[PDB]
Write a protein that binds this ligand. Sequence first.
Ligand code: NA
Ligand code: NA
Lengths: 528, 528
Amino acid sequence: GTITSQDDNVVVGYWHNWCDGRGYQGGNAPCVELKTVNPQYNVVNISFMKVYDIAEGRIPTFKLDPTIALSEAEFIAQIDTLNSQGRSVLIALGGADAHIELTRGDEDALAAEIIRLTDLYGFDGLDIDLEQAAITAKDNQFVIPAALKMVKEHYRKTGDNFMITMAPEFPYLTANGAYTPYLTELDGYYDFINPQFYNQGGDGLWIEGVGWIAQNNDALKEEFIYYIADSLINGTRNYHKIPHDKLVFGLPSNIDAAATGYIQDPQDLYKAFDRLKAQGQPLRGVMTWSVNWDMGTDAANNSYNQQFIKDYGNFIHNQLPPVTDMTPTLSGIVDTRVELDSHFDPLIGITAKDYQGNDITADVTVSGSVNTNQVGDYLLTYSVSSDDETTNQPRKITVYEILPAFTGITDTTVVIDSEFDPMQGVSASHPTQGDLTANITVTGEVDTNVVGVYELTYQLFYGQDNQQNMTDKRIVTVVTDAVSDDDWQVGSTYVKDDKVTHNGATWTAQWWTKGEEPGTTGEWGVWR
Amino acid sequence: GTITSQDDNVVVGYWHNWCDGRGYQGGNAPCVELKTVNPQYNVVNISFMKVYDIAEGRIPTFKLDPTIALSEAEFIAQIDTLNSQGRSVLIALGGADAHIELTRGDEDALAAEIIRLTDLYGFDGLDIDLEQAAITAKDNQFVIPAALKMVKEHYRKTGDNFMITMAPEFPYLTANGAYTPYLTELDGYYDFINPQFYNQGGDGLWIEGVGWIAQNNDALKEEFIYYIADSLINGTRNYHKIPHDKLVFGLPSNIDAAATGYIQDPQDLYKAFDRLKAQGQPLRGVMTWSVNWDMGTDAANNSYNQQFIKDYGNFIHNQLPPVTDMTPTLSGIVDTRVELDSHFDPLIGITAKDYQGNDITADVTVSGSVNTNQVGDYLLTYSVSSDDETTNQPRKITVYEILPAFTGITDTTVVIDSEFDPMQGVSASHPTQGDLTANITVTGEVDTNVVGVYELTYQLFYGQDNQQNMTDKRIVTVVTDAVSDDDWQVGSTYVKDDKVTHNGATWTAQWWTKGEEPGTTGEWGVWR
Ligand code: NA
Ligand code: NA
């Protein structure tokens, strides 16, 4: 068959390229022929494209496990059967222990291997299903989208829609998270995202109305499904926006398929999707790990016998076709702090796209204005319109000021008759105004000919018209060069005629003394 | 001593209430007497207050490990020594395996035990250092702040500032994350937050300018420290805002103290803090797990010998006192979808506080307006001012419309001469307009006296002035009651005079026949 894409809702199901996987609860997932997969799975994702051996280089590939008992030719043939039934088969890039660590430059070779693989096997597209380390390893965030653009474009040249999907774990979908670049770069290119709402344990979100809603809380599954989707489809509560027509809810097929996340009561899902529909935002489908688990056995060797597709197949397919959200996007906008009197350009770094990823940065308009000449806050609003929709985003610009700093104003002692220059070693500076040393004034003088304490106040005038000012003080002590009688010690013993300095005077002992303070022994005492 | 709080920067250090902890790299952390802790740690957090035995009930407590070789009285005395040096000692609530699972109602007993413990030991406050499960377990998110308000208030009555700090792991500080309620409820009550920027492996953030910055990337530690702090102190890049004067950067003391996060080169920190200062937002300090690790040995039994406080002590303390960010806050604002013609009240659910947590909801103003009578988008802006600052936040209100639905318009067959009522089993409804069955019109008729196909178009008029419309079609087939000659089969064998129906006629075989279509055997053939 040829490139078969889906225009209506999807029920996506992953297909293990290996046999006898072990379940989180002791159960078993056999390998299955493609042709045995329930027709209601209209997207089947071959798992996984990966690096098989670093000795083959960095570009991941696909190699069928022969023990699934499908020849290469027969595998191609079962793909062809699915296609002739109108169903899609994707290659899923990633999975555990994928050893995908791409460098800048690798985008050309990756694209070529993707196309090679799609032409040989008859794949209809590619699901980005990166494991943790791989989301961010080396230049993956750049190489994988760059290559995927080239691939989407190759097949658009011949009139085909090569599909692009992604399976991020939901906690990665916050506005500034690790999946950002995949979602923004492939904006307009991707066909839908199927996040994994499972294996994240107590992770979840806070709904200012009703509290904390955890992905593993079975009492509040309906609220989990609804608020997490509502958040994604409106880009609220700190999630990157994924339009409802492009959102597929990923689940474990049963308790053996994932550690946490399985929906115990399907009603919770039916009701959550029904509420989303009621607000005019029906979702695009559901996804599951995996067809094998839906066909596996639990640990008492009892057969799961298709329970997942029994629960959700008819529910998802019996719905209207999706209605495209055509709102455009704004990128690069972040509240920003600017130094007083810097040049500020409101457009720099800001870009926009229409809903199919065309660049429409030129159409961006800005209201509000910044005065960098006055400290304070200024609100800008950016807006852009296209295909009869509009998006806006605010931006806070705060203008602020930094105080200059003095250096070299420390208290110092100088010897009588020295020369003292109040400015030697003294300067001032500011980060944008520079060397302000010439803007400093000195109040007070030092008389080096006269022992004593001289207090100097340094003033710095600065800013526009030198109308700002700071102040600091310094004490300069002019001390005597001349040697004197040693200071009296409370503990020392003194002899008649021994002399000491104490409290500014010189005193002579009239006899033997210990511990009597000169000045305290009255008119006729030991110290005169 | 009495309640000793810090007004200047802090270097916080945790103190193990146990001996000989094992390091992530095989090293050893001995228990240490409080009095041996380096004076530059001006906040020392006793670790941990927790549930010791569920058989004592739910309220966590503190019990000193006697093997640290400190009597109760001596421990109180070393606390007193620290206090007389102007230093603070906090009780850290949480840590691993704390078994803290509080129910609504428990806030009174918790507060009382906190006060009891603070009065006996002379603690100056409490650090909320909840382990993963405990952040969100049962009603913790409600009980812990409720109790902490009562405690802060008890000691404010007698003129004391009981300190409140928290040590969330940084990935929990996204705008809508699990730590939300602690931070918003204790807003104005807490003295500073010391997040843990460690143990999170590859977690990090995306900077639209330079890419992905991981907490374990030693090549970009300076950029990690700077952008994560910048984000927190401005509430940008999807982080809850923690003012710079209240942000303390938590680190591992060395590679044995944490799996990841340790700063290899201190310069990276010095430079990051220096840049934050340069933008007018110097931070409040640094924190470390822990004094014991700073005093422990590595696995070759070589002594760490205070390397952390050597690196950061002087750096942090030699800085200006903190300058309070007095911007107020807005809560409850989330873009919202409303059904066409619903009542929308712009204030409901929105609240505000000043920077010390006083309620100032009444001062909130709103610009922009919503018309719920016209589908489309409406931007509101909320604003509030206090202490000569202002905060604003936008809110998108989108008004939308849901299509009504027909029921009972399915194709049906009826027997000749029956009575047929185009409306039996037919209705229409809408979610807010209700039963629209009376608004349906039927175009076409059915003549039950005449065999044939009758096409009916149902129209539904609706909305304001019944000026909206949808349409659907139904085919009603009126079939004959009367029995007829069986249909000709290609495979059947027929005898002279056998008769069959085919293509609307009755035909009689002129002899033996198989597989000849009546109507195709010309003027003189087998079928007449
Ligand atoms: Na195909
Ligand atoms: Na105290």
